Design a protein around this ligand. Structure first.
Ligand SMILES: Nc1ncnc2c1ncn2[C@@H]1O[C@H](CN(CC#Cc2nc3c(N)ncnc3n2[C@@H]2O[C@H](CO)[C@@H](O)[C@H]2O)CCCO)[C@@H](O)[C@H]1O
Ligand SMILES: Nc1ncnc2c1ncn2[C@@H]1O[C@H](CN(CC#Cc2nc3c(N)ncnc3n2[C@@H]2O[C@H](CO)[C@@H](O)[C@H]2O)CCCO)[C@@H](O)[C@H]1O
Ligand SMILES: Nc1ncnc2c1ncn2[C@@H]1O[C@H](CN(CC#Cc2nc3c(N)ncnc3n2[C@@H]2O[C@H](CO)[C@@H](O)[C@H]2O)CCCO)[C@@H](O)[C@H]1O
Ligand SMILES: Nc1ncnc2c1ncn2[C@@H]1O[C@H](CN(CC#Cc2nc3c(N)ncnc3n2[C@@H]2O[C@H](CO)[C@@H](O)[C@H]2O)CCCO)[C@@H](O)[C@H]1O
Lengths: 261, 261, 261, 261
């Protein structure tokens, strides 16, 4: 089918990409980076995140595969020595697909912008602590004072979320997880402290108290947002699809990345 | 229908129980503590946990209601001033039911004992640190050295799980959450650290390394287990059913118990 | 003696300041904001931090006093109702002085700038995670990847340090405490995790790995630093002096601010 | 001088002990385990803790040395390959001594028992959560509900204290650090959460609320205490003395044990 390959852009990844293109040329496979059905990312998880965002408008037509030319990735979970086996099984096709949940982020300013996240979306201020009201399904839950907030997908829970004390969640769970960054807690200021895990259809709204300018990130992409009225989080109806050719369980990937490999 | 009322056993709860029995006597409602269809717990969450375990063999035939004669409870979420309104709406019936997930704990010793938990099940040793191998879906995930491990239901996440750094999970999510108690981490010993959230059908097995005697708790009930070969955790196929008469969202209950009320 | 009064600048603080100046006019007390021997801060801890920095070059000639016109402060630990009693005991003088340790921050760029902190100094990057080598007394201790690092004085331990998981340290201890902000830890990246407490004469050096631009804060003052070669932390030889008129123990101040009041 | 050697008791440690005794026999060195001036511990930190407690009544007459026949220890910080060099430099003598602070634990029951700790002393209940009032220098600071409390020496901060979230403190600091084990925090129950670091001469008193029976540990030794009225903690006036023959800085020992070696 139509496929394309993104590369980290160092010599090792660029050369592996060229060798895989050569191997695909021996099958009924057409290189097409406009409407691919297969997107192969060669690099690390950063490269994979960029592949996801390059093709976020055609997620339901695409199966993603990641090859890690460095250390094992949570998305780039194939080794370069298996690239030839990958070309072979990918050309034939008929592989099974695995789908992970995504996070929808809506930013309102007086209009709306929407974003999809594979890892997480975070909100911080223009320096120092900021203040946001946290509203869950239209009920005021807490006034947060601190460095920021992080809302993670299940597959993102091993990323920023983990460093913030969040739980690691198996990606078959359709949920998002909100973690705090250095909240102030004293007699006057009060937050929940604990990470919060939300099911599908719950909406978490972050609303300004004084300052209306925030730094909002979606995966690696961080942009200063001015005149923001609201940041709304919910589990997306869209999913990312992976081509899988062998069993590599999430919990084994967690073991291999954090425990020992 | 058939109903019964458990009491914390102080004067306030005992008297409220007698007044509710009097009120039920004006409707087609029969007091029956052998095969009730409605179980009302008057006290706090401890009283409610005990009601759950008193009737754990007939969970699919029972709707539970909790009245808190002290502070607001996560299970005992009705005020005593509303007991008369409760009798009224309960006698008529036709209320909606809400169901929360439960945790199945299997203890193997060379035979099996199974237990159901509404809050959590924990494993500790006979003093000092103990060592257990943690096996997830038959793959060895970590060797845990420390004080113990806690496996929580969603509604249990606001209990022991929270004090151990776990995430708070909305109880519509069919999952269990494993948290660590003071794990040892150095160059030689390694655990994940982070809480782990498992979906239905995942099995987490705790297996001895040296000592085979453990203290195992299920909700409040803690018993020394000798010659243990394995402790297996999975989300139960059984659920607890609550009678609900008004909206009291989980996230509002969290707000009211931990943020302000 | 020579004294001055800084105000938060709202009506309540401005009026209390004018009334205290009137009261001081009945004693041998001269208002002098160039070379005061007594600096009274009326507001909150932010106002007090600003008073400290306004007079950081004459710290050994000054005794500070803070009045909190809002909630109790850790520095502004006097109530406005006692301002008249304060004027009285301050005019007479001969009060005892209490001294807290300070943090010296040296920034090297190829020259040096030095700063004094009463709460803490922090280092962050120009967005996303940054990388710094942490060198303790000239031995490489860790390569830190994450959001930033915080080095706190003892009296600062109840501030940002606390929100980052640091220990609360009694201010009679001549030490500084380093805490992490969201460190990355996986098979490849490794930090200590735990807060670190350093005695006097230990030097902690933060050194760039790739990017050389950082955001450095000293108490409230945050400035972008370009072409930084090193940030060095050590307990200062200078101390801040408080005028004390009654016993208000640090641990009682902690109790009153975080437990109940 | 008079010396003795304790062994872990496995073949490797027993044989190294016999070889060191043979080497000492070539110098003016007398084996004496009643009144040694040098105590050499061969094993790990557990063996070293036991050596300390074997000779806790003659701490000011003894310099301790630890050899680790397994992984590097924080107390057993010499390698077995250097035992011959150790015998040599130890026989000559005139080495420098390094002293670490200790923790005094006083247990009152209606009489007093006192204990010295090199790592920590902890208090837990006879199962489930217990309740203790925490009194600092005779002022009630908090009512703690949870699993237990840990009071650590500086050199103990890398042990249980670290697993509980405590700060790592350089052992030149004369202090003790109190950490919580799974405290309950809700609208009704409130603790500080943060580790607390106390200077010399501060006294932290733990006092019963209901149950008067506790499990009290001092280093490895854990004993059920009945009819306890109070547990008092303070930095001891006594210190442990180490014989040092080369520079092995505490922060390098921390690096080597937790970061990489
Ligand atoms: N203080 C922080 N702590 C922890 N994580 C943080 C912090 N700040 C940002 N992040 C994560 O960085 C993601 C963006 N980043 C690409 C990626 C990724 C990724 N995805 C993962 C996943 N799902 N599980 C487990 N490791 C995952 N990584 C790893 O993260 C490290 C940092 O890249 C590298 O080892 C990656 O293999 C590039 C960032 C630099 O340009 C941003 O999305 C946010 O998550
Ligand atoms: N170190 C610990 N930290 C935190 N929680 C702990 C710890 N150790 C045990 N637990 C919890 O105690 C549950 C058993 N207990 C009855 C209950 C309950 C309960 N259930 C809750 C829920 N789901 N959400 C939020 N608060 C909930 N509580 C509250 O807990 C406090 C202690 O009861 C009281 O305020 C209760 O309203 C009786 C215990 C004494 O006999 C045991 O099941 C374990 O969870
Ligand atoms: N994410 C954070 N979490 C926690 N603290 C943070 C975070 N980021 C910065 N800080 C602290 O703010 C100090 C600067 N700030 C003035 C001050 C102070 C102060 N000093 C204290 C002390 N020693 N003990 C206990 N509470 C203390 N506060 C309180 O902090 C809150 C925030 O001011 C207010 O209740 C103050 O009474 C003004 C900041 C806004 O313009 C900066 O120095 C850093 O510490
Ligand atoms: N949940 C816990 N988490 C963390 N530590 C705990 C926990 N519970 C007890 N402890 C510590 O155990 C000490 C008693 N123990 C001997 C020792 C020691 C020691 N001392 C150290 C130091 N100062 N710094 C750094 N590592 C140090 N260790 C290491 O601890 C591990 C467990 O021994 C081993 O790697 C030892 O090298 C024997 C215990 C078994 O019989 C008890 O004193 C308490 O600290």
């Amino acid at each position: 089918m139509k496929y394309m390959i993104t590369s980290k852009g160092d010599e090792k990844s660029d050369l592996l990409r060229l060798n895989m293109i050569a191997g695909f040329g021996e099958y009924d496979m057409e290189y097409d980076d406009v409407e691919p059905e297969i997107v192969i990312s060669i690099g690390g998880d950063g490269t994979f995140l960029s592949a996801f965002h390059q093709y976020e408008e055609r997620l339901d037509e695409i199966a993603f595969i990641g090859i890690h030319t460095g250390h094992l990735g949570f998305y780039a979970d194939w080794r370069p020595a298996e690239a030839d086996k990958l070309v072979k099984l990918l050309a034939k096709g008929e592989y099974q697909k695995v789908s992970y949940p995504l996070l929808k982020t809506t930013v309102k300013y007086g209009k709306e912008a929407t974003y999809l996240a594979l890892n997480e979306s975070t909100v911080k201020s223009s320096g120092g602590p900021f203040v946001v009201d946290v509203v869950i399904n239209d009920i005021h839950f807490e006034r947060f004072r601190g460095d920021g907030l992080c809302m993670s997908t299940p597959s993102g829970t091993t990323a920023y979320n983990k460093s913030l004390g969040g739980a690691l969640m198996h990606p078959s769970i359709e949920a998002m997880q909100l973690t705090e960054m250095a909240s102030i807690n004293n007699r006057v200021y009060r937050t929940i402290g604990s990470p919060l895990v939300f099911p599908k259809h719950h909406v978490v709204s972050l609303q300004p108290v004084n300052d209306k300018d925030f730094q909002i990130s979606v995966d690696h992409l961080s942009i200063l947002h001015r005149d923001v009225q609201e940041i709304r989080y919910e589990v997306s109806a869209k999913k990312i699809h992976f081509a899988r050719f062998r069993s590599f369980p999430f919990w084994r990937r967690v073991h291999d990345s954090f425990i020992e490999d």
